Amino acid sequence: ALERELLVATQAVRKASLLTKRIQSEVISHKDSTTITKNDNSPVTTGDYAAQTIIINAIKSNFPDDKVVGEESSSGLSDAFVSGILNEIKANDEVYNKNYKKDDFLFTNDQFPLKSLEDVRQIIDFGNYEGGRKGRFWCLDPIDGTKGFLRGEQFAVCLALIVDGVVQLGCIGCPNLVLSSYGAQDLKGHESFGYIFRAVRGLGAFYSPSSDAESWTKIHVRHLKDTKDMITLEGVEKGHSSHDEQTAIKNKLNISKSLHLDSQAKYCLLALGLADVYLRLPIKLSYQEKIWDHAAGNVIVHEAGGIHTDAMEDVPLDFGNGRTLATKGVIASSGPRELHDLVVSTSCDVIQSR
Template sequence: MSYEREKDVAVQAAIAASKLCQRVRQDIPAAMEKKDKSPVTVADYGSQALVCKALAEAFPEDAIVGEEDATALRQPEMADALTKVAAYVKEIESEATEGEVVKWIDRGNGKVASRFWTLDPIDGTKGFLRQDQYAVALALIDEGEVKLGVLACPALSIDTENSGVLFVAVRGEGAQMMPLSGGAAKAIAVCDAGDRANLRFVESVESSHGNPEQQNAVAQAVGIVTPSLRMDSQAKYGAVASGQAALYLRLPSPKSPDYRENIWDHAAGAIVVEEAGGRVSDMNGKSLDFSRNVKLKENRGVVVSNGTIHDTVLEALKNIV
């Protein structure tokens, strides 16, 4: 099955969301707080509103499983925040009203189904707040498999002239990257086994997002000696897919050994890496299962590699964990 229309709609939605995020970042508002204490800004809500509106209009039957919902924004004490969100959205969608914006955000409250989209409107909110890396991550899961992934990284540079990168992958068609500002797409591929300069980790800035001790042990086991590349968000998947790094590990923190990852934190990045020739699995070598729940309940940890070192990494993890 061709996913050309889905790709076109997803790309345009991610670009629109990225424009809003960059507009907000010119004057970052104070972070609001969700129940889990992670920061969320008006950009998260605005980004989700734009993407959900686009998907709902193009594919009204498709469920959307997004990270945010508008419950907090509907509270009287959040009236000023809702006004800000609607104002930013209105700069891109002129017909936006506060009422429409909360409806668009809540369009992302769908359930996992035989065909659905999963969205992280800003993956790496802490990176966004500190003027570092973040991503708008959107993926389509159809019949249990990720078929399309779009990863917009507005703060990632291709070269000195182009800031902002869009990664796109369709199952069976390879992966591409292009400037967010427009321009030609080019095919990307993971680094090969002989590329010693890029045989390195890409790691989270936040040490709490993994297990640094185990990661260092794995590095030694597979012969990684080059200093790590550090960045927030699924931009790390983009780094592996485009050959800038060979390995990304998301190992459970010792403080939360039973933690399971959210599907929107990995779906878009996973297909981009796989279509670029890499490999993605959990710590036991099992494929990530995006088909059952908003959590990757059947998977513990995430291993992302250029493919050639994957089995060695899994073997090292058996001896370390």
């Protein structure tokens, strides 16, 4: 099961990973024309939109009826802005097809040719599904960690398939990820556009350099015995999680090592066995996490042998509630259960002591 879906997800993420790697420096340099502010003041760039367009167009060319929950919308974009999205797509195609073309795989077809400004708008807006409890849908964050992208640091291209509220398939491109930065080994070909991580429920978790994406290496969480030796994974942006409460947890558990980076690349490092505990405590309890921020990681961490819950109740995440998660915060770990429950119960106690 899901063999065709896995191929499509992988190639879609692969092409978008090249585009976003290549753009990163020009967006930052031209970040007066390439960057828009959304209704919540968060940034969105030509890259986010271009990645969403490539990925949804590939999904639709292969699965015409499929539903997609994608973060971005084309509403209000000018023709000038949309022509820039199209240009970046076609510029990337010219590099990608010389070098990385996959035989017998289509990114576009007769019904979804991706030729005009109007095609771009239509494809972006196929991401307007609201999710829910029954049936099959794709879940897409075209650039997870846009603030990291803009900082020239880490970001991820994230695609998942949800069926009956459960994540069945996940694929995360980490285009700027260099494992030696974390003291670990890099694989042949990693330098051009990073790594892809993927998993299908029941079938294990794997990775490959993005430029390869043909030879897959199986991954698994590690198992350290004492928390004193462990490493946390946390975000960089102080407004996205409660860093001081995370520090309280670390101190209580005698953890003295942490890696800060943007995006679901954090789940990939956990699944690879390079750290032990992902912490994302909520600053404001009114916030509802978006499914696209966690869905691909959920199945990858599970298939790598880890555990994924909220930050307070210690319950599984429920991906059948619409666009958002109803629980508060997120914690993932290598397990075992006893370790995971120690962490989440500490998190609960810290939050309740406010």
